[PDB]
Every structure is written in structure tokens, then in C-alpha cells.
């Protein structure tokens, strides 16, 4: 149950929480091993893994009207802030083969500033889609965003912007 | 006595199947890899198995028990010039054995 | 063990010296775990779980405070201590500050208004 | 009815999630119980009640970027004070599995 | 048996914990001399008498140091 | 009983030779999650359909797997469908009640047949071209480093916690490789003469690493020397030896 939600939360649904791409993660199963308002605590928590589930599709088809270089820097900067997303979902279950007394709050509270995270940088995944950049402005519109105003958004998009860089230093050294 | 023996070392060896703290049963090797004993009876089935197949027509003289260093011995013996202990003027072993004696001979 | 030679094992953990040297301390000891021994008052982890906390305020140190409450949660949900009461008693007594009174903080009942 | 029943609708609305025999029809107005045990409720649930406004501003004014930086900031602020609430709220989970 | 380690690994578990508490309190204790207080409250003992002990044993080894 | 019973105990023998699981348990929902959902299933009436898989360990499966990805074939678990290994509908796991089973197993499955339709290839090469053979090499050369990696984990299983989210990611570096070579085999597919079966996919080897001009660019070098080398033997040859010899024609320059 507390490893079916970590597979659940992380690429692979289940039954229990069964996936959509017009809602994400949809329980609504009568539990009688659960409280009613428990599903509620559930919903809040499926947020989290709708965003990283629409996150490594998008990294998978790469490599439509989108294509270049650019996006062979960004989606790879993409998997670089989703890694302490994998390190934080091994430590749960690591703690959870000894203790199995722990509710699903512990797991709420860990991964509190990754639901900080993932909205901010959802507008970002969505923000080159609808509007289509694939030139070298994507740094431009990254770089807007990276003044931020919510910490954790403001780092993650710095190992970002140091990737697209380093991929303009390659065309200005053989260049230049 | 108790809190003596209470340093003891504990498991490390937990499951997704029994949880609580499960003190290990271990990972269950196969035929191939869980012999060395496993090897010793496989090959005690087997002569038995075919002892029984055929109808007690066969007859193994026990190509175990020597175990190495004394068939070792042994066939070092034979190429001196004296003789071995199966010839005088695993059931494999009796395949390199034959050709390892008719050389003393 | 018994309490009586573990008492020594106490006088030998502390000291480094033999028992056979020291032992007008290990006379003074005998006299006040002597005939103040058990259990004479009522024991109530949950004011010490309070205390406990009142130490980790006194350092102002939050955090592990919070840490304290899964730990004796713990203590709890394995079950195999008598006497749960007296260890963090112990422990809390015991405490010192890396870097006040309690005569206005009120304590346990002590069974001298109940009969024995 | 049991107690234990009531101390489950407690737990969770704290956060803002409404118990199975705990509801608030006037949002306004705090929770409303759907002898003495009974009376101590409602200053009970009063924390949770502010709970809900604490979160549902910075719900909204964390996504603004037409309110600045300050203001991103008090949002962060109130973010984490919120995020050690949550922490104390699982011990009181924990203790289950009298509780009063 | 097997259920008389099992016991034997659930005191286990709290030897660690009570390891914890003591350590984020810091007594001057280890882990050695705490195996003889916790068998101490096992048979039940004041810790108003115990600590006071403690506090006087101590005061007799950087006296002949 | 006294070599069934030595049987049983040290080596398995319970879904792939028949002996029903008594595997014991510790239930209560974090473990026992499949019987609660179909308890739950009965009481909200189905009605009856007894469903009917036939309880596999958990280890058993991760281990079984790491022999399927390694790059050796027919294994019990995962039904086949020409020579494509599939999820195993007839197997159980006491929680997770078959359904993220389902997917993982599945992603697991889709390495399976690209490493199967490879090492096939490879075989069929032994049961000539000069660009094949060392095309196969190269592939071989890689496939022996990514096995011995397999394989010492596998040693390393029997000598603690395992469950599935370590070695899955502990094997990202090399599924992310493993998928490289099926589009470098996609266009090895798509074949009349061997000059241009050779020179078409060779440039394509050598347009790819200045596309991404790391652990890639790597991988495509190594393949890239080992194909290019036929050619620089044959001309060094031409140079040193004044006459031109190919293995029935290497080169589109009739002399």
C-alpha cells in the first residue's frame, strides 16, 4: 500500500490509482480499509505525481513542430531537477521496511516543496508548447522565470540555464 | 546476560512481503548455484533414479568416497609404475580415470 | 544480575579504579539506593514528555523537540520496559547544555495521600 | 457513539479536509458538530479554521507574478510555517497504532 | 527459540532509541554504563535517588586524578 | 521429504515446478494489499469470478528479469508471442494487487525484445561481408561489458534489501544505452549491393556523433572505430601494396 503509492506517484498507476490526461491519478474507490475523508488527503497528494508523470512523457518523445539542439538541453536539464525527486521517493521506502507505522502525512511533509516545484515549472513545460520556441530564445524565456520569487523554483531553473549554456559555448568556440 | 547478549548484530535483510522487521530466510539459490551439498545429493538421486530405471542391472562402485587428494595420490602412484586402486595387471570421474590409469599401465 | 552487585558495576563503570580500592564511595551509594529503592510515588510519563520538551524550550531548540515525540512514540509501540517512566526521568536529570527553578512548576502525586 | 470515531474527523480537520461527522455548511461560521466531550469541540476546531484561510491565500497569491517579488516572498514565508505544521499533525496520526 | 530473538531484536530496537534521547540531551554516559542503568530500571528504582548517585560518583574520580 | 524436503527448502520449486506457495506472511494492508482488494471485490459483490494467478515471490521475479535483460533467452517467466516476451498475466505479488505489476513489467519487457531481437541477430551471424562481422563485433564488445555489470548484481543479491526502485535505477545508465542501439538496428533493418548497405549506414554512424558534438557520444565512438576499420585496412593496403583486392567489391570506384 505505502510501495504501491510510491510506484503509483512515481510511472506506474495501478487500479487504485488509475490514470487520465483530463484527471490524473483518479481515486474514487469505496475503501473499507480507509476513511472517508482520507481519499481527500489522497487527491491532495496525487497532484504531485500527475506533474512528474506529464513531465517523463514529454522527456520520452524527444530523440512534432518542436526540434532542435535546444531541446536535447532542456529536457535533459529537466531530468536533472527530477533527481532529487527519485532520491526522495528512495528514501521513503527505505524507511518504510523496518517502520510500517508511518501514515501517509510523513511522506506529505517530506515532499512539501515539490508541490512548489512542479507548478511553477509546469508553466514552463507548457509555455513553449502553446507558443512554439525552439530557437535560441528558449534562455530568454527561461531567464524571465529565473528571477522567480519561490525558492525552490529559483534554484532548479539554474541548472537549467547553465545547461542551454553550455551548449551556446560549443557553436561560439567552433565559431570563433 | 540479556542486555550482555543485547550487542548482538541485527538484520539486515527486510521485505515488501513480510514486513516488520523479518529476520531473513535467505535468497534460495538453484541447482547450479546451491550444490557443494545440493551437488552431493543431486548426484545421489540420480545414480539411484537410474538404478531404478534400469532394474538394479547397472551397479555403480561408488565413483565418491575417495574424495580428490587421495584419488590424487592414487594416480600418482600409477605413474611410478605400481598399481592403482580400481586396476592391477561425480560418475564422470570414470572417463578421466580410465585414461589416466591405461597411461601407468 | 541482582541490584546488589550491580550497584558495584555502577561503582566500576564511572570510577576506573578497582572496587576493592574505592569503596567508601561504594558504601555511600549503598545507603541512599537502600531504603529509597522502588517505586513510591506515581509514576506519569506524560508530564516528563512535557519536561522534556520544557528543556529542549529551555535551549530553544525546536526541532529535536519535535524529534522527541516520534521517539517516545516509539517506546511505546514496542512495549518491552517496565518502567517507562523512569528512564526518561533519568535521562531528563541527566541533561547537559553545550550553549532554572521549580517552585513555581508542580510535580507528581507522591501516595502519601493514598494508602500504600 | 464511540470517541474514536470523533478523534479521526479531528485529525484531519486541522488541514482543512472535513470529517465524516465534522462539516461546516456556513463557511463563515466554524465547524459545526454534525456531554462536556461534545462542548470541547468547537475550540477544538477553531485552529483548522484558520488553517483554511492561511492556505487558501497563499494558494493563490504564490502563482502571481503581477504582485512581485515581495509578496512571492511573504508566500514563501507562510509556505514554510505551514510545512512544519504537517509534521506535528503525523505524530498525532502516529499515536494510534486511551488517546486523549 | 526463534520468538526468544525476536524479543531480544524488540529490545534491541529500543536500546537504540533510548541511545537517541540520551544523546540529544547529552549525558556524560555511554552506551556501556547505560546497559547498567537500564538493567537498574528494570527491577524499579527512583532515578531522585540514581541520579544523585551519579552525581556524587563523579566527584571522586577527578579527586584522585 | 528427506530430498524433496532439501529440495524444497534451499532451492524454490513453487510456481515453476508445481508446488503451491505457503510463503508466510505478516498481512495487514502494506503487504497483504492483493487479498484486500479482493475481499473487497467479493463483498461488493463481482459477482463470484474467482481469479485465478499463481503467486510468485517477490525476489524471485527481480532476479528472473535481470537473467532476461543480461541478453540470455527463454526464461519461465513472461509468455513470448513470436519472440516477444510479454507481461505474465498468471503471476501474483502479494500487494500492488497486478496492475502497477502490469506496467512495470511491461516497461521491463520492451528492453526485453530489444535486447532479444539483437543478440538473435548476433547469432544468426555464426549460424562473407566484412562490414557485418565487425558491425556484429562492435555490438558484441558493448554487450559483454552491459552483461558482466548484469551479472555481478545478480551475485551481489544473494549476499540484503532489494526491492525494485534500486535496481531500476541502478540500471538507468544502461537501459538509456540500450535503447541507442534499436535505432542504430532500425535502419541495419532496412537493408542491394554491400557498398551502399555498408556506406549508408556508416554515414549515419558518422553524421550521429556530430549531432551531439556524456555517456552517449562515447557509446557511438566505440561503435564507430570498430566499422570503420575494414576500410582503413583496405586502403592502407591499396596504398602500400599498389593493387586493390576486396572481398567481392568493398568500393564504388571501378579500377
Keep these: ?93 527505505q524507511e518504510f521496511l523496518g517502520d510500517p507505522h508511518l501514515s501517509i502525512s510523513h511522506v506529505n511533509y517530506f515532499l512539501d516543496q515539490f508541490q512548489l516545484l512542479f507548478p511553477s515549472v509546469m508553466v514552463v513545460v507548457e509555455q513553449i508548447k502553446s507558443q512554439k520556441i525552439h530557437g535560441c530564445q528558449i534562455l530568454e524565456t527561461v531567464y524571465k522565470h529565473s528571477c522567480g520569487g519561490l525558492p525552490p523554483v529559483r534554484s532548479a531553473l539554474e541548472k537549467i540555464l547553465a545547461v542551454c549554456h553550455g551548449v551556446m559555448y560549443k557553436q561560439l568556440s567552433a565559431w570563433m | 546476560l540479556w542486555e550482555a547478549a543485547l550487542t548482538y548484530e541485527a538484520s539486515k535483510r527486510r521485505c515488501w512481503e513480510r514486513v516488520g522487521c523479518p529476520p531473513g530466510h535467505r535468497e534460495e539459490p538453484y541447482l547450479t548455484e546451491a550444490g557443494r551439498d545440493a551437488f552431493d545429493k543431486f548426484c545421489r538421486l540420480h545414480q539411484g533414479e537410474l538404478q531404478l530405471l534400469a532394474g538394479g542391472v547397472l551397479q555403480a562402485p561408488q565413483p565418491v568416497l575417495v574424495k580428490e587428494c587421495e584419488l590424487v595420490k592414487d594416480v600418482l602412484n600409477v605413474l611410478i609404475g605400481v598399481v592403482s586402486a580400481t586396476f592391477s595387471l561425480p560418475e564422470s570421474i570414470s572417463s578421466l580415470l580410465s585414461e589416466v590409469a591405461e597411461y601407468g599401465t | 544480575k541482582s541490584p546488589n552487585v550491580l550497584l558495584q558495576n555502577l561503582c566500576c563503570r564511572i570510577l576506573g579504579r578497582s572496587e576493592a580500592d574505592v569503596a567508601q564511595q561504594f558504601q555511600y551509594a549503598v545507603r541512599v539506593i537502600g531504603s529509597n529503592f522502588a517505586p513510591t510515588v506515581e509514576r506519569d510519563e506524560f508530564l516528563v514528555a512535557e519536561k522534556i520538551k520544557k528543556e529542549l524550550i529551555r535551549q530553544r531548540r525546536e526541532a529535536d523537540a519535535a524529534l522527541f515525540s516520534e521517539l517516545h512514540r516509539k517506546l511505546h509501540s514496542q512495549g518491552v520496559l517496565k518502567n517507562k517512566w523512569s528512564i526518561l526521568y533519568l535521562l531528563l536529570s541527566l541533561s547537559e547544555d553545550p550553549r532554572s527553578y521549580a517552585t513555581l512548576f508542580a510535580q507528581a502525586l507522591p501516595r502519601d495521600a493514598h494508602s500504600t | 457513539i464511540t470517541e474514536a470515531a470523533l478523534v479521526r474527523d479531528i485529525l484531519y480537520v486541522f488541514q482543512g479536509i472535513d470529517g465524516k461527522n465534522i462539516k461546516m455548511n456556513n463557511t463563515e461560521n466554524c465547524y459545526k458538530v454534525e456531554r462536556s466531550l461534545r462542548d470541547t469541540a468547537v475550540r477544538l476546531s477553531e485552529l483548522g479554521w484558520l488553517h483554511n484561510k492561511i492556505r487558501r491565500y497563499t494558494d493563490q497569491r504564490s502563482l502571481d507574478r503581477s504582485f512581485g517579488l515581495v509578496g512571492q516572498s511573504f508566500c514563501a514565508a507562510l509556505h514554510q510555517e505551514l510545512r512544519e505544521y504537517y509534521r506535528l499533525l503525523s505524530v498525532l496520526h502516529s499515536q494510534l497504532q486511551s488517546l486523549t | 527459540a526463534a520468538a526468544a530473538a525476536a524479543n531480544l531484536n524488540a529490545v534491541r530496537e529500543t536500546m537504540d532509541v533510548l541511545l537517541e534521547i540520551s544523546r540529544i540531551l547529552n549525558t556524560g554516559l555511554d552506551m556501556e554504563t547505560l546497559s547498567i542503568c537500564v538493567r537498574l530500571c528494570e527491577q524499579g528504582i527512583n532515578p531522585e535517588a540514581l541520579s544523585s548517585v551519579i552525581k556524587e560518583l563523579r566527584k571522586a574520580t577527578e579527586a584522585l586524578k | 521429504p528427506d530430498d524433496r524436503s532439501w529440495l524444497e527448502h534451499h532451492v524454490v520449486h513453487q510456481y515453476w515446478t508445481a508446488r503451491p506457495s505457503q510463503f508466510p506472511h505478516s498481512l495487514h494492508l502494506h503487504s497483504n494489499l492483493a487479498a484486500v482488494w479482493d475481499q473487497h471485490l467479493y463483498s461488493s ?202 572481398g567481392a567489391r568493398e568500393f564504388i570506384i571501378q579500377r
Design chain 6, 45 to 246: 459483490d463481482p459477482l463470484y469470478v474467482p481469479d485465478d494467478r499463481v503467486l510468485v515471490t517477490e525476489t524471485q521475479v527481480i532476479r528472473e528479469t535481470l537473467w532476461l535483460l543480461s541478453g540470455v533467452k527463454k526464461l519461465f517467466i513472461f509468455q513470448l508471442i513470436d519472440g516477444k516476451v510479454t507481461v505474465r498475466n498468471n503471476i501474483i505479488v502479494t500487494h500492488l494487487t497486478h496492475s502497477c505489476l502490469r506496467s512495470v513489467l511491461e516497461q521491463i519487457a520492451a528492453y526485453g525484445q530489444v535486447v532479444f531481437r539483437l543478440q538473435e541477430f548476433i547469432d544468426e551471424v555464426m549460424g562473407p561481408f566484412r562490414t557485418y562481422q565487425a558491425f556484429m563485433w562492435a555490438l558484441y564488445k558493448y554487450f559483454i561489458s552491459f552483461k558482466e555489470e548484469l551479472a555481478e548484481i545478480e551475485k551481489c543479491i544473494i549476499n540484503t534489501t532489494i526491492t525494485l526502485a534500486i535496481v531500476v535505477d541502478k540500471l538507468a545508465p544502461r537501459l538509456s544505452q540500450l535503447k541507442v542501439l534499436h535505432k542504430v538496428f532500425s535502419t541495419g533493418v532496412a537493408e542491394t549491393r554491400n557498398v551502399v548497405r555498408a556506406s549508408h549506414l556508416l554515414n549515419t554512424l558518422y553524421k550521429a556523433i556530430l549531432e551531439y558534438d556524456e555517456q552517449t557520444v562515447s557509446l557511438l565512438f566505440s561503435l564507430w572505430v570498430e566499422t570503420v576499420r575494414p576500410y582503413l585496412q583496405t586502403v592502407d593496403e591499396w596504398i602500400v601494396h599498389g593493387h586493390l583486392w576486396d
Design chain 1, 1 to 93: 500500500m505505502i510501495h504501491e503509492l510510491l510506484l503509483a506517484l512515481s510511472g506506474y498507476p495501478g487500479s487504485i490509482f488509475t490514470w487520465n490526461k483530463r484527471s490524473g491519478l483518479q481515486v474514487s474507490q469505496d475503501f473499507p480499509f480507509l476513511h472517508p475523508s482520507e481519499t481527500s488527503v489522497l487527491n491532495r497528494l496525487c497532484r504531485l505525481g500527475t506533474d512528474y508523470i506529464r513531465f517523463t512523457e514529454f522527456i520520452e518523445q524527444y530523440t512534432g513542430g518542436l526540434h532542435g539542439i535546444y531541446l536535447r538541453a532542456f529536457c535533459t536539464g529537466l531530468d536533472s531537477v527530477l533527481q532529487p525527486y527519485r532520491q526522495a521517493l528512495l528514501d521513503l521506502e
